[PDB]
Amino acid sequence: TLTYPFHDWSQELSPRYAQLRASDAPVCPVVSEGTGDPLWLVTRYATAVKLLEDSRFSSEAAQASGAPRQEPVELRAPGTRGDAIAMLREAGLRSVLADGLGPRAVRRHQGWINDLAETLMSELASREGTFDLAADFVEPLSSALVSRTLLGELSADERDLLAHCADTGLRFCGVTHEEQVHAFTQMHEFFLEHARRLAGTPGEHLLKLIAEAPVDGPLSDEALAEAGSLLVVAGFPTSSGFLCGALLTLLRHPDAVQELHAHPERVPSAVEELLRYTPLSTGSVKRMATEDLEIDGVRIKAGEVVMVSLEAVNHDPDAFEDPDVFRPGREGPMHFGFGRGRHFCPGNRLARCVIEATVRAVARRPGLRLAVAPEEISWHEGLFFRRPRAIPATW
Ligand code: HEM
Ligand SMILES: O=C1N[C@@H](Cc2c[nH]c3ccccc23)C(=O)N2CCC[C@@H]12
Ligand SMILES: O=C1N[C@@H](Cc2c[nH]c3ccccc23)C(=O)N2CCC[C@@H]12
Ligand SMILES: [Ca+2]
Ligand code: NA
């Protein structure tokens, strides 16, 4: 009877996750609030590893039109496929995706990324009074990441349109179903008109590499538009949400920032602890059983969908000692912030790059603090990917 999700839109995780984790079942039944579909939910690290490393639990089947789902509307423009990353790997573009997202891309971009983080923070430090870290730091940094490494250079109006589409479509509630569907239509139509132009501009952004890649015909306009929409939904609200949330974590732990100021070699460990500690998605990764399967004794029938809450797994006390403590350099198992298994985040190298640049910018300037109490922060309610409306801050 427990409905999903748990409406924990701020950084305070729903107590339900710890309740289910401690129950006498390794997988617990829930019901989608948005569709009424029955779903399974996993909250334990050990069980999550077993699920996400078993390829008979399929991500593509759980994404497909008509699957039991946690979200109220399908995450695709009506009439399109909506399985972009599979379509691209299918067309044989794994080598291309690695070139635009892997370590070689990080080496191309890390210089200007760190310059931009410093320039943005330096500007804020020159101001008298308070400022807004979301509007004045995260938005320009995440927008530059999307323009320069993924899509090609966007105007402010185009960036605002894509941001609004992502915020409207990637929601559990707070907008009508038809508004949500039309957000995906608008984004698809944007790239039908503009993807070729964006791919043709100078630079090495991923969309250009995709459009220029030989495919055993070259990618059609619809396929390139689905690639554009993928890069927005997977890269934009995730990066902006996480950087906002990571800044809040740092601002609430001045002792840890002071340690990083004195010992910059410890920043990479802080990046990894932020990926474990800072909650991002309010939903779960999910997979469909492609046949009758068993998870730690519980029978999962073919066609049923099993969810894993990455936040729940990242706060599992059997995996991490004192899991609700922000402890850079804790020496436990690998976090689940980027997932697990074959679908591990391919953006993880660029994400780590921008997170590291942000942590270093903060650590160089101790004294940065929230200008309001954490409880006074206002949160966007119903987003898949948590984000505060503003982060008032000052030195
Ligand atoms: C440029 C930035 C990013 C890009 C281009 C990107 C891209 C992608 C793509 C294309 C996928 C789909 C993989 C698949 O289904 O096989 C994915 C998955 C994922 N991403 Fe990223 N991502 C970015 C940033 C982030 C950030 C900041 C996080 C922070 C937690 C994140 C967490 C994840 C997770 C957990 C998954 C796994 C989903 C699953 O297992 O079903 N991503 N990413
Ligand atoms: O490439 C995908 N992977 C999975 C997980 C996911 C990864 N990033 C996401 C962002 C929003 C929703 C889901 C995801 C998915 O549900 N997908 C629909 C939109 C993108 C597609
Ligand atoms: O909230 C969601 N999370 C992703 C998985 C994910 C979990 N954590 C993530 C972090 C970044 C990207 C994707 C994820 C997913 O598959 N969804 C389908 C409907 C809602 C949406
Ligand atoms: Ca169905
Ligand atoms: Na798999």
Author numbering: 3 to 218, 220 to 398
Please give sentences taken from the publication describing this entry.
Further, the in vitro assay confirmed that NasF5053 could produce NAS-C (47.4%), Asp-A (44.4%), as well as a minor product NAS-B (8.2%) (trace I). NasF5053 adopts the prism-like fold characteristic for P450s, consisting of a large domain of 10-helices (C-L) and a small domain of four α-helices (A, B, B’, and K’) and three β-sheets (strands β1-1 to 4, β2-1 to 2, and β3-1 to 2). Our systematic mutagenesis studies on the promiscuous NasF5053 and the versatile NascB identified four key resides, Q65, A86, S284, and V288, which play critical roles in controlling product regio-configurations and stereo-configurations. To obtain insights into the structural basis for regio-specificity, stereo-specificity, and chemical versatility, we further determined high-resolution crystal structures of wild-type NasF5053 in its substrate-free and substrate-bound form, and of two NasF5053 mutants (Q65I-A86G and S284A-V288A) in their substrate-bound forms.
In the substrate-bound NasF5053 structure, two cWL-PL molecules (cWL-PL-E and cWL-PL-U; E and U indicate extended and U-shaped, respectively) are present in the binding site, with full occupancy. cWL-PL-E adopts an extended conformation and forms multiple contacts with the heme group, loop β3-1-β3-2, loop αB’-αC, and loop αK-β1-4. F387 and L77 form hydrophobic interactions with the proline portion of extended cWL-PL-E. Formation of hydrogen bonds is observed between S284 and the backbone amide nitrogen of G286, with N10’ and O19’ of the substrate, respectively. The hydrophobic side of V288 also protrudes towards 7-propionate of the heme and indole ring in cWL-PL-E. On the other side, cWL-PL-U is mainly in contact with the heme, αI, αB’ and long loop αB’-αC, including a T-shaped stacking interaction network between the F388 side-chain and the indole rings of both cWL-PL-E and cWL-PL-U. The DKP ring of cWL-PL-U is further restrained by the side-chain of Q65 and extensively stabilized by secondary interactions with water, 6-propionate of the heme, N10, O19, O18, the side-chain amide of Q65 and the backbone NH of A86. Multiple hydrophobic interactions are also observed with residues lining the binding site, including V236, L233, I87, and Q65. These interactions therefore force cWL-PL-U into a U-shaped folded conformation, bringing the indole and prolyl entities into close proximity. Notably, the folded conformation of cWL-PL-U brings its C2 and N10 into close contact (3.2 Å distance), making the intramolecular cyclization between WL and PL in cWL-PL-U possible. Importantly, the indole ring of cWL-PL-U is positioned perpendicular to the heme group plane, with N1 forming a hydrogen bond with the heme-ligating water molecule, consistent with the initial step of N-deprotonation reaction by P450 compound I6. The indole rings from the two substrate molecules also form a T-shaped stacking interaction with each other.
